Symmetry: C3
Subunit: 256 residues, 3 copies
């Protein structure tokens, strides 16, 4: 026997009749124990039983009651704790070190130690993983990611939400490379060691890994792994031979 489910079920049906202030402590204690059990994994909102996923509605009700029963409170940075084996790049950097490096680090942007950012780089809130190199004058916009070992050239614009995929393995593969003077538009993804050559304009919504067809609409040639210099690329599709569907492709629409 466990009374948690029944107590939470009853309180949720009764929820219009109490508030956070006058909540009886047994309901309050039951909600806490439900939250603690969700937190240590001894309870879970849904689980697979006899081959089928089953939802436990009373645990959803516990989550909802925990919102009802707790007021907003100040939360400080000290309440965030982490645990990892790679140091962050700027811990214990002085103001002199920051000024000498010439990089703007907009909170809450983080770079890992073992990555490099040249002078006049701006890191909006974003992530730069270990082994990456970001050259002079480059803008890394909000929630962008410069993945492990990626090489970002000079005067590059990585727009918001852009992901530059990391490459460690295989050891012989080139990392993902964005050459000088490229524009990568919002929520685009360049991964798996693809190279975008110099002076290209990649619009928003463009996904390119090693399997993406890069269709030059002027020549008809399908390229892989490399955007030729000066390409303007937008998202598109290529038709199937039967005409019943089409598949995503990156379309080179002009060469500038």
């Amino acid at each position: 026997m466990s009374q948690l489910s029944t107590i939470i079920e009853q309180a949720f049906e009764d929820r219009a009749n109490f508030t956070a202030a006058d909540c009886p402590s047994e309901i309050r204690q039951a909600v806490e124990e439900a939250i603690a059990g969700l937190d240590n994994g001894t309870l879970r909102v849904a689980e697979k039983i006899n081959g089928e996923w089953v939802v436990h509605q009373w645990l959803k009700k516990a989550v909802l009651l925990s919102f009802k029963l707790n007021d907003n409170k100040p939360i400080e940075s000290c309440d965030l704790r982490f645990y990892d084996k790679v140091e962050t790049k700027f811990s214990g950097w002085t103001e002199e070190q920051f000024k000498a490096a010439g990089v703007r680090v907009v909170p809450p942007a983080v770079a890992r130690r073992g990555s490099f950012q040249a002078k006049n780089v701006v890191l909006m809130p974003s992530y730069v993983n270990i082994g990456a190199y970001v050259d002079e004058g480059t803008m890394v916009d909000t929630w962008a990611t410069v993945g492990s070992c990626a090489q970002i050239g000079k005067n590059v614009h990585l727009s918001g939400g852009v992901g530059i995929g990391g490459v460690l393995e295989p050891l012989q593969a080139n990392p993902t490379i964005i050459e000088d003077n490229c524009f990568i538009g919002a929520r685009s993804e360049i991964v798996e060691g693809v190279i975008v050559e110099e002076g290209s304009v990649i619009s928003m919504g463009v996904y390119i890994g090693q399997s993406t067809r890069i269709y030059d609409r002027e020549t008809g040639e399908i390229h892989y792994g490399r955007v030729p210099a000066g390409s303007v690329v937008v998202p598109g599709n290529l038709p199937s031979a039967d005409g019943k569907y089409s598949l995503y492709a990156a379309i080179i629409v002009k060469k500038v």
Copy 2:
């Protein structure tokens, strides 16, 4: 009468003739008051007047002058403040608790209290909302989101920018579920209680909610809400009957 607009207008026309160092204090004070008014909402860069949106160019000029007139300075974590009713999962976790749980929490990753992560999970900078369960060996890549009550299986790879949508209401609906051994590629989105069954490979750029057609190109069947086990899924489109447009669809291109 307010002189803010005129002072900011004049200073911006005159901006090549002063710097942050020798800026006269009246310009400096006007810029500050403009920023304070934008911050408390008594001023706004654009507003709807007589049914039309109007831009206030002098407030854009104030924002630009605030960049010119202030140097970069160290900003610490203590300068970030929050305000919410749900505790974060790891506040006051000891090193012993971190080691016992076996989860790597890469800064600045945050999970809410009332979510669970099994041993050998790696949280790159990412978010795990309340009620979610992330099973053993799973990787949550940078700027991914595990939404409320979602169930992530064992040895799952959530790539960068992947969103697993939360499900609280309706109470009877299954949460979004990623079964064991799935790969979800970058900037893909699995939402609204969709289940991705075991061993599937979802490429980057795949969006699946309850309204997304999942087209099995081999059988011609259109599925909803569920990716069958072992599916390889990529973004595509399906043509309209008139052939004038096509609509986004997730394409099952092979079964592995």
Copy 3:
């Protein structure tokens, strides 16, 4: 002569024969120096030599050895440092100020000073840039971005990963505008001063800037820059005249 490459090469071949505990200090010192050189840019994983990008495999091996040779440790918020010229909005806000403003700021959400959030706004972990205005009751979901000067209306839902693009220059251009009662679905992007008019439903995966065709499938009209009020918009494609490819377009599929 430098022995770093040889030491790292040898240790990596020998890696199954030592651990972090009993690693000889020369290997440990070589790995550290490799990491320091990657961090200050004097070493880089790949570089362009005689017109071709070359990978330095021993630097990848150094990165991998740095994982092997260091255990996870607690990392605190104090180890994150930033450097920027714009203050964050809430630093030194009291509990009274937070309660009076009526905005939930879910860690690690950050807004810049000079942006406004009305009562009953919820900022999930997200970013609100300077000059933006977020009206009453609006939800900004996880890893969304409200860009500079953007105007978000009342009772708007910005879903996870949504980017609302910033607009400062040109001075005369309207910022990006989301009117009252709009739903913007996950990982969608509204940029470049586009306006989404009141009561529209934008599905996930919708990208709209000034160059995106907004195709009204009922009338056949192609709109730019503006989503008419009450539109339901989903991602699609429009066919080329030769039928060899199609290009991304936002499809108005009904008017509600």
